[PDB]
Write a protein that binds this DNA or RNA. Structure first.
Lengths: 271, 94, 46
RNA sequence: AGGACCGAACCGACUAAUGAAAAAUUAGCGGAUGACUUGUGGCUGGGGGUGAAAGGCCAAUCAAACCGGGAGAUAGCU
RNA sequence: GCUCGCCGGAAGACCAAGGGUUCCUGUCCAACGUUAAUCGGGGCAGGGUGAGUCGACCCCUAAGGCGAGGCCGAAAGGCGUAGUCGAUGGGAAACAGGUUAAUAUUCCUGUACUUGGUGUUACUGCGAAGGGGGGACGGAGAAGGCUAUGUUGGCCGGGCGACGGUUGUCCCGGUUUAAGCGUGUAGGCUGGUUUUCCAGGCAAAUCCGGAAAAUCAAGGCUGAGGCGUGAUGACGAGGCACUACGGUGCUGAAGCAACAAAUGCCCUGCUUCCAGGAAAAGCCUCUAAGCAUCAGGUAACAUCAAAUCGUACCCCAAACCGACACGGUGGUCAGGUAGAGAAUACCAAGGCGCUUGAGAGAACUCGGGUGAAGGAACUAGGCAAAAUGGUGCCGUAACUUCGGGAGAAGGCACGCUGAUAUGUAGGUGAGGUCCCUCGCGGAUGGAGCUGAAAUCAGUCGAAGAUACCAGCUGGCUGCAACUGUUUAUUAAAAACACAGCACUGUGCAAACACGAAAGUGGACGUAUACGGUGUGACGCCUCCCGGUGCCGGAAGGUUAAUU
């Protein structure tokens, strides 16, 4: 649930917490863990390539299963877990053959729930089956775009996709963006919505909270000198130019999709 | 097993000093100058063969050379290896 | 006042030392240059 | 509980008067569990870096570092 | 040598880094030392650094670096796989005393430990580049158990006072002891043991994981401290022999108890929070190829082994970074009285008086003290000074986002002695007595020790938070919501950032950014996400598309290469 914190200090006043009691209070499943060091938004050349990244808390990498290939074995949900690496919540599941995996926790999922992947699998939340097997009009998440690759669409805290149509070898998806997209009908998808839907209701409430999430502060181009940004300079507050990136490209409207290879799959762009 | 020639080349000299004299008289320990490359076991072997005397143990150290000045010109003395060789009780050395 | 030079031997060697100079071309040229000049201390190396 | 309070260390540098000091002193001053501070090592290189942005900082040097070279640049000027 | 004075969370002690002989001894005083110099971190000569257990080396890896092939690139070269390097992190082992002019966990004395070989007898499944476990991990908070350490008493030794008193409830000093081995406690974690099966752990697995079934409630792991031993020892106040006045040799009492107590240890624990918290090896374990009655494994016992390098000295400084014998510099140690305290004052241990002195006692300057009467009249401005200053209790407005405002404001008490109470409330806790699955056990018990806070009565002073220390307060108002950041060295702000808001892009080989490219970041993320721009908590809100941009359209006009 969301929780407005009492204003016992400025910087706590405007805070809203998103508290799920059902998460695991404990150390995660260590076998599925692995190291994940921070970039600072800097590439192999050592240059900053994406500004405003830096610092934040040390995080491990949970090995989430997005490919979801344990066909026919039924699994049961052991617990839900906090993943620092994503807006969603993860679920530690236990297959009957003794293997455990992390999966995106869907909306209704909880400890004790049974889930299943496969063509034969049942059409219920958390189950995963090819979209030619999934009825039209259903909500799914963790959608593969290429068969066998692993889910790439609809992984964020409260996303999902609509299968609006199945026309032969393809099905047409309604993406969260509003973009309509063809996808091969043999690609895989998980039933239901992804879990942590009130994720958006949280409000950080202070500068430090943003820092905790590895976000360095943002300087406005207009606050700079001309040598730095197109917006710089001006005695007092001047802005007599069309908005642009630090690299001179228009920002308020100018489209930038250039991919002519996948134009065919886009049924309708978002609006 | 150390070669005789190497043994002979190990031992440079006895070291005379107050501390050395004290070590000799009290702890039955001789203070030698030895080759800088000479290891402890080597030194011991050489002691045993060339002075004909049982060794308990060898401690070694490296003495660094002093920087000196001959007139206006600066110049450094050689570094050299010192060895305290403790000799078995009752071992009297000439 | 913390002055610019804050010595550290390892850091000195890695930065300017012989092997570092050897590693890359340009360093090798520097070395060659210094040899030509007649430098007694070719590198920072003690 | 807290980018909570008072306050030493520690980090800073608002007022004041005054070469031991190429930016210090003393007296006061701000923060002091955090967007803190600090050691060791690492990475980013010059129209390039980094920048909670002051054209700041990049070895007492910055509206384009230093070293060497073109180079005895050119100087209707002194 | 005796006085005086200063530091004492340092101006003491020990290290790292950095320096590199500055260490110690003798000797010299030209130069160096802001003066003199017999002295010196100066000159010259000699001496000095001892390790299986400290550190490096070594095994393991992080960020990162290099990188066979490889991909890419006019050349140079870039990226990067396998790999290999890389500590600031993980990985076996030593303590006490004595000694040098100068080293010591390194020498000596005592008492230990480690992990390798080799050989043994005893046994008999060993075996990895592979599987599993472990190592292995955050912040804050709270206690409880402890010790370091300190105080008092007891004990032991010495003393009987340069001036009134001082054989006592008097004075001074000491009252220390390790690692190791044994015990396995306060406490923490977990249900154990056996059997059966199984699409999992790249193959196999007796291991892990998962299913069942049986049976017992104690099983294991961890763990400070204490106790015992170590120790008939060592050390020991000071006494006694020699004296090159430096010291050397002999000798040696007591060596207990209580209370208090860390920020250190149990604790890598427990509780809790969200921001969700290295890796690999060592270590344990499982098997595979293999080998097969051999090797290898574990078992004790014997022997050998532990190489190499560092070890002096300075290290908040006269030895490092600052041109100087001139501010900066990470870690560890942390006594007493008062105190909340690592603040402050005075002291201990220890270390210093800052390498020019001597006079004088003009102006003027600096740093301080006090000041009649006035009390901001000063001044751009109360700048600077002065003032406030503690604990407890009473009391406290507007406004408010109901948290605040608020230590609002303002007041009262405060010393010492006695009594309450030859020391209370509390804390601690010995004997005795009882229980007992027997121990570091549980009950009862209260000796002794410690010990606030209050009330009443008296008492001194001008003054009792007496020194050091230690808020000035209130009223209206602009700006910025707030904590933060900034022009290293004239600007700390109303500037930047901020949480929040909005627009816009981006469907993943994402947009974008660095890269002739390969590739990398974005992100091991996927529209509840990421990028860009503006605005900037919260509250109430928030006409013009002509111009320039952007988006969409494509009927016509115009229009490249080409032909």
């Amino acid at each position: 649930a969301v929780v407005k914190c009492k204003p016992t200090s400025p910087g706590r006043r405007h805070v809203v917490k998103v508290v799920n009691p059902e998460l695991h209070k404990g150390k995660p499943f260590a076998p599925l863990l692995e190291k994940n060091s921070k970039s600072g938004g800097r590439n192999n050349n050592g240059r900053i390539t994406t500004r405003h990244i830096g610092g934040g808390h040390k995080q491990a990498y949970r090995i989430v299963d997005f490919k979801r290939n344990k066909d026919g074995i039924p699994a049961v949900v052991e617990r839900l877990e906090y993943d620092p690496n994503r807006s969603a919540n993860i679920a530690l599941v236990l297959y009957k053959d003794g293997e455990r995996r992390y999966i995106l926790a869907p909306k209704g999922l909880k400890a004790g729930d049974q889930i299943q992947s496969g063509v034969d699998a049942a059409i219920k939340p958390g189950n995963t089956l090819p979209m030619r097997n999934i009825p039209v009009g259903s909500t799914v998440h963790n959608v593969e775009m290429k068969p066998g690759k692993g889910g790439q669409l609809a992984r964020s805290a409260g996303t999902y996709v609509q299968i609006v149509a199945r026309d032969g070898a393809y099905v047409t998806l309604r993406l969260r963006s509003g973009e309509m997209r063809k996808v091969e009908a043999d690609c895989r998808a998980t039933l239901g919505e992804v879990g942590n839907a009130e994720h958006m209701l949280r409000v950080l409430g202070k500068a430090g909270a943003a820092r905790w999430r590895g976000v360095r502060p943002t300087v406005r181009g207009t606050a700079m000198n001309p040598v730095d940004h197109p917006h710089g300079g001006g005695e007092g507050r001047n802005f007599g130019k069309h908005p642009v990136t630090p690299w001179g490209v228009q920002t308020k409207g100018k489209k930038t999709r250039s991919n002519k290879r996948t134009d065919k799959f886009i049924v309708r762009r978002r609006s | 097993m150390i070669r005789e020639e190497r043994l002979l080349k190990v031992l440079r000299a006895p070291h005379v000093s107050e501390k050395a004299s004290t070590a000799m008289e009290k702890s039955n320990t001789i203070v030698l100058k030895v080759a800088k490359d000479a290891t402890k076991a080597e030194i011991k072997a050489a002691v045993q063969k060339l002075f004909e005397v049982e060794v308990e143990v060898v401690n070694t150290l490296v003495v660094k050379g002093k920087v000196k000045r001959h007139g206006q010109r600066i110049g450094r003395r050689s570094d050299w290896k010192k060895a305290y060789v403790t000799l078995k009780e009752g071992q009297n050395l000439d | 006042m913390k002055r610019t030079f804050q010595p550290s031997v390892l850091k000195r060697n890695r930065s300017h030392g012989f092997r570092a100079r050897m590693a890359t071309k340009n360093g090798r040229q520097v070395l060659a240059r210094r040899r030509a000049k007649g430098r007694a201390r070719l590198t920072v190396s003690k």
